[PDB]
RNA sequence: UCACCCUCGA
């Protein structure tokens, strides 16, 4: 048969985070596309990030780096939060070298051709008097999240997904004759690589292809709609 | 096991470990006798 | 009441009632039992009018 | 603040309202055709109904009405079906379950009645028991089980932080809780695994805050490291923004204390929304908790046969001793009762010793969600001794647990006590009800009249070899009072001044300074001619602040005394 | 079979103390200690035991087995309570030499005093004929009763006989031996009085031809209403040409299935908290139970109306109803009675009846019509019978008695017509489900078949029972019922190559292998032991795909049908017998904006039948006062109940969208004052400083608006 | 009043801020009730002093007025 | 006398109250409940009941 | 990272397994469930709306000579699997006289509709049994309870029946997880009534989900 | 509709 008026609207919280509402859905389909959209947003969007880092002078003792107050653990934590977009499929190495007492920022890194650092004002470490920091970075594209995978180089947890946090909920908004229809609320928070709008659009395209895989099976009758 | 005192009754296999020396009397006898 | 005065019999009744209620592990704040006891002592009898 | 209201009930209850609004719109020409339209149930009414109901509260009541919280106001939401949908947190107030209970709905009409419903009787406005001040409307049992499972710590779980060994890094730290969520989506990070996370949006404990920051300030986005579980992180997310991080396994006692502090300091609406979020998360993680019953999860004590053999050897010694006429008959029965009491306790101890701490039965009991261990002892361990119809103990106990199944004799013996109690409760509730009625009658004339008696009279409460020994009655007697004479000690300072709320911080600071006794105002010594004064009565339990003037505390006191009446046994 | 202690000649209700209600040690084998009311009749009503019979003197006797020389014979001796206390009685569960003798040194026995003890085997005079000797019928139908506490066992016994019949009856997969016997003795089943062969079988009757050559025919009760509204259908279970022995079941009753008592359905149950919709004893159902009519029940209700002779004349049952459209009358025949087969809704006319109007209450605008148009013959009003609120169905049958014909009717009553209306009630939110083990609950939500957690092969569970309800209530017989129910659903094959495993050696005779969906019985106190159930849990036969879906723990992996992720831990699933108890929302929902009042006190009536209001009682007013909500308490007590001039004022004000006026005086207070005056008490309401105040009202307040509405 | 999730329906406006404008809950009851029936008298007498909703109950409008201190009162 | 008569032992209370010719002041709560008057507690107290409500002139301008 | 593919396996005529791979790690369960929920809920089919028997005006009675009452006959008629190409209200007929068993093969369907289980028992007739039934067939989706005679213009003889439109019987799934290169292989398992083949149902749900997820863009 | 009584429900 036919069911119509499934509109989609967006409430903008921040530039990197938004809520979307898909309403109204039949008593099905509230939870069918609920978890699938979230898992797609999380695992299916391509994005580039760090894989491994190597810092000199810290090789055998990973506990502390002289000249800086932060430990190596805090350095890796700060470094995993860096947002980067790379066009090269093969891995690309960057370098960050800064001397003298002060504060290192993401802008102090020199991006090789094709890669872009989206948050220059991010904090990495602070250099003590007569301090110097030299660190190699490995950046490559991927999807989702993967744990730690030349001696002196350590792997990190790679956060490839351009989206950070996605949560969903379902609520009833139907007609008085029904009062049971589902409605989907999606809270999505993404990195500076893309807006939540583009993340949702890419997830929709990928899932359209996924399901489309099935449609090609018979290309036959199914529930029609009015507005897309 | 069989409970074959009643004809045509469905076969309900019984876990019973003890024999029944006496059968349930007429459940309405309290009324009909009176 | 007659020996130790009205100010003491209120304490006696409150603690006895609250003790019975505490024997069963019941949390009743004392102010309620005090509100009830206060009503018990509001009149005086008359010996010689 | 919501209740599920069937469509038919709402249409019949609001019938004149929907008729008026249905004449406003041109669905009906006159009011008689409007009545006929609401009686025929033509569809046009329903869209109108949803309008007339909006922001119009109703009153839900469950009999018997033991305290004022037995009637509560709700905002009605139209619901498909013919059943009333009740919020799960307001059960404890109503003593309402869903084993076949029914409730009644009353529609206020006048503006003043609707205002009293929205302000005085609103569900989310009364979160505290007016009797004890404790908070009802706290996660009840299922909800807790979920929280208990969500915040508990599992040594050796998946994703557990491990220190760096050789060339192997730590791999137990996460930059943000979102990264921990992503790691939990994969099979890498368990929710109950101990890890390290950088928390930007949560306030640390007082210790970590005072060390890493100043006492005066912490701000959103200020990062700090914590060794917790992701579950405890998500739990602390439910709590409001300013509350410090807890990092504890959430027993019902602990979350009870949390809600106590939230009600003592934070406003009411925040507490209501907080317990709502706790409800949601508790139900989700209760579904995910994996608590189930099976004949395998019920573990029989392994040495029970030997224990029973030994204690019945003792009892056989006692009976052989009685056969020579040495022991008295009543003394014989007393001795047997003692022997089998000890045997019951020993079997229960063995049972608890054999039960792993992750078993669903032990998890249910010890999390404080529901049950007590004596039910676990009767279920798996042993029934024990059973009551006589006269009330005495029978010298032979029931050695069979309900897992093994009782014999014919043990079942027949158990029936005695079972029915004895079933009958006793029917008279006990009547006694409690009559006493409550008499209390209501004698006390209903007691209401607050003026603000302050101004009298310096009061009463002395303890609160306490040269060490502090706390008084068990502080909550029932000392707490919630008003200080008539400000606290003074040796080398004294201003610690608690006359007329203070005497809450938890005041009590703690009083006890720390070396205070061992206090003299506080009370209703007993109040000097008002008719009624009582607010300052002498103290804070209102349900509100937490000073009692208002219009309050009729005699009825609140009568209900508070008579409500747990059916619990008093011999 | 009930035994009631109240009545004329016995003790009154106020003479009933706690000591008469308790279980007496002489009730063993005579009165069941489990089956008894939960309410004020507790201990006052008790069911007779199974093997007990009434003495000619009026005593209750119980059979026993005579033990001579320590051997147990087949000689049964019935004993009264007097004769019993002289002897020491053994227990039904007893070790027995192949010849018959006690292998244990000292057995447990009921003393003359009734106190339990130990004694050798040569002193035992009698032994119990069987376990369940102490149990009634309804209570002995609880499997694994010995695993339940007397409270929940009592609730289960009392709830079995509250179950409605279902459109088709499904015998329980796990039961006792009492279903068959209780069904055939109950009397609602059709039994062959003499051995023969069925000559003819119709839905209307069954005719059998004996070997005698004598015909015997049995008419089927078809859709007959019972006393409580439950439908009692009868369906033949035999075909034409079958040879039936005397005593066989020919046709099933309402809750019987092939001769056995079937009070509910075998449902696939999962034991786990599910998103709080089963919180605090609620129950989650699969929508299948609606679509497949699993818990659907037929509810018939009888409506009755009579036309009689009034002071103004005689009433008439007629289709002619004044001021009524032809459309609403369309379902009525020429008599004014509704037509068979029509579907009726709230307010539909079942029987048209007009009543002569006295014309004293006749309308002034209607007397205009009667005087101007000269209406002479018929001055009547509509007393026609309508359908009550919340009730709808299909008219099954209509019976009618007329004074114009020869029929016995009470004086003055001319005609009397009964209309029967049946409704098909699906299971729904609020309906009450319960098992045999005292586990009750209402339905919180019925999820679609997709939302329901499903097994590995995609089979969604039927009912989700919350876990927190099992352990504290001491009804674990439900868990063992679930385990054995899965074992009976999937069937089992115990391996017997060098077999006879020590666990299966004791009880199982041919319970070694059982085909899927077998029917098995666990007699109370003789049911399957725990070891044997744990053994059956292992040899569970796989499904059609060769998968063993339920492990040896009785649990299984379930998939969340909403997100799709499997639930992390294995959950106990199985087959439990669930009954639909006779407490339904369609019966219990009630609402009243305004309705009829009692003519004496002018308060709203009470009861759903009378379209009454809810009583706002004394304790509710205590609560309202404790809140300090004065206007709510006044409004509830004046303009909603007793203010005769305030009720219509409030309705008029809300209808016209105005504010609610100020309350008046409760009429019942005037009734109180008149009652005191009738007691020679001079009661007077004083003014502030004045004398008594007149409490009644003049009649001239109502004329202005009437004369204005007529356009003076 | 710091951070809290936006109220929904009846609980809007929050009672903690409304009790800050009144000495007692009962006085707030009478406050909002008299203002509400005053507003309803206006529709058949002053107000509303704020923007009314789509279809706002008069008591809700009165509460929203009391929240913004748009009216005085005397006991 | 009305409260006492409604509470308990109605016959004796009414007899003694008729002899002494008592006059109920209609003061307590239960009395106002019986006669339908606004109860003398909470919102029914003259302090709260007679509150005057008027818009401020500053808002009356707007 | 190669484009995902969908392959089919066949077990019986009405049951088919499907294998989708490669998929992101942890993604297989969600896809299997998003398809399964759609299969049970919203696969269109055909079923009987309302029936009509000559000698009976309402559901709670007995036709003479037949062994089953009208309610038992209706519940047996609930087992009927039927297909319709009309997508419009149509009428099948049944005229049978005993002594014999009435089955689904004894119904005469009109053009476009087909009865897929003639061996099903309906009712049992004897010498005096005579059964004449009209069966209105319509095409819809999901589960629609009987349309009451007050909603439609039906007359008293009309006996509306509950119509179960879903051709799908049972759906399940299982995933294979593989952990440097991690991926999930989804395996759907669809079983339908003889109304349609699993490929048709899966394609219908695929088009439905494509139409729905097209909203994200 | 008023009064009883009975059997139930939380
Ligand atoms: Mg209950
Ligand atoms: Zn005072």
PDB file of C-alpha atoms in Angstrom, chain C:
ATOM      1  CA  UNK C   1       2.714  12.974  85.147  1.00  0.00           C
ATOM      2  CA  UNK C   2       1.875  13.762  88.760  1.00  0.00           C
ATOM      3  CA  UNK C   3       5.334  13.013  90.180  1.00  0.00           C
ATOM      4  CA  UNK C   4       7.724  14.434  87.570  1.00  0.00           C
ATOM      5  CA  UNK C   5       5.415  16.984  85.932  1.00  0.00           C
ATOM      6  CA  UNK C   6       3.795  17.388  82.517  1.00  0.00           C
ATOM      7  CA  UNK C   7       7.061  18.280  80.779  1.00  0.00           C
ATOM      8  CA  UNK C   8       8.463  14.826  81.608  1.00  0.00           C
ATOM      9  CA  UNK C   9       5.454  12.612  80.835  1.00  0.00           C
ATOM     10  CA  UNK C  10       5.573  13.884  77.244  1.00  0.00           C
ATOM     11  CA  UNK C  11       9.185  12.710  76.942  1.00  0.00           C
ATOM     12  CA  UNK C  12       8.205   9.381  78.506  1.00  0.00           C
ATOM     13  CA  UNK C  13       5.317   8.760  76.101  1.00  0.00           C
ATOM     14  CA  UNK C  14       7.296   9.908  73.054  1.00  0.00           C
ATOM     15  CA  UNK C  15      10.254   7.660  73.797  1.00  0.00           C
ATOM     16  CA  UNK C  16       8.061   4.645  74.640  1.00  0.00           C
ATOM     17  CA  UNK C  17       5.995   4.961  71.444  1.00  0.00           C
ATOM     18  CA  UNK C  18       9.064   5.636  69.294  1.00  0.00           C
ATOM     19  CA  UNK C  19      10.805   2.674  70.945  1.00  0.00           C
ATOM     20  CA  UNK C  20       7.984   0.296  70.036  1.00  0.00           C
ATOM     21  CA  UNK C  21       8.028   1.659  66.479  1.00  0.00           C
ATOM     22  CA  UNK C  22      11.829   1.303  66.363  1.00  0.00           C
ATOM     23  CA  UNK C  23      11.632  -2.319  67.540  1.00  0.00           C
ATOM     24  CA  UNK C  24      10.203  -3.154  64.097  1.00  0.00           C
ATOM     25  CA  UNK C  25      12.678  -0.870  62.314  1.00  0.00           C
ATOM     26  CA  UNK C  26      10.258   1.947  61.473  1.00  0.00           C
ATOM     27  CA  UNK C  27      11.585   5.473  60.907  1.00  0.00           C
ATOM     28  CA  UNK C  28       9.018   7.916  62.300  1.00  0.00           C
ATOM     29  CA  UNK C  29      10.396  11.342  63.144  1.00  0.00           C
ATOM     30  CA  UNK C  30       9.643  12.330  66.714  1.00  0.00           C
ATOM     31  CA  UNK C  31       7.840  15.569  65.811  1.00  0.00           C
ATOM     32  CA  UNK C  32       4.775  13.583  64.695  1.00  0.00           C
ATOM     33  CA  UNK C  33       4.450  11.668  67.965  1.00  0.00           C
ATOM     34  CA  UNK C  34       5.041  15.000  69.707  1.00  0.00           C
ATOM     35  CA  UNK C  35       2.162  16.587  67.779  1.00  0.00           C
ATOM     36  CA  UNK C  36      -0.038  13.724  68.947  1.00  0.00           C
ATOM     37  CA  UNK C  37       1.139  13.763  72.582  1.00  0.00           C
ATOM     38  CA  UNK C  38       0.697  17.547  72.822  1.00  0.00           C
ATOM     39  CA  UNK C  39      -3.037  17.040  72.313  1.00  0.00           C
ATOM     40  CA  UNK C  40      -3.172  14.564  75.209  1.00  0.00           C
ATOM     41  CA  UNK C  41      -2.133  17.247  77.742  1.00  0.00           C
ATOM     42  CA  UNK C  42      -4.248  20.333  77.029  1.00  0.00           C
ATOM     43  CA  UNK C  43      -6.850  20.189  79.820  1.00  0.00           C
ATOM     44  CA  UNK C  44      -6.601  20.327  83.609  1.00  0.00           C
ATOM     45  CA  UNK C  45      -8.939  18.739  86.126  1.00  0.00           C
ATOM     46  CA  UNK C  46     -10.467  20.824  88.916  1.00  0.00           C
ATOM     47  CA  UNK C  47     -10.282  19.916  92.614  1.00  0.00           C
ATOM     48  CA  UNK C  48     -11.638  23.104  94.207  1.00  0.00           C
ATOM     49  CA  UNK C  49     -13.302  25.397  91.670  1.00  0.00           C
TER      50      UNK C  49
END
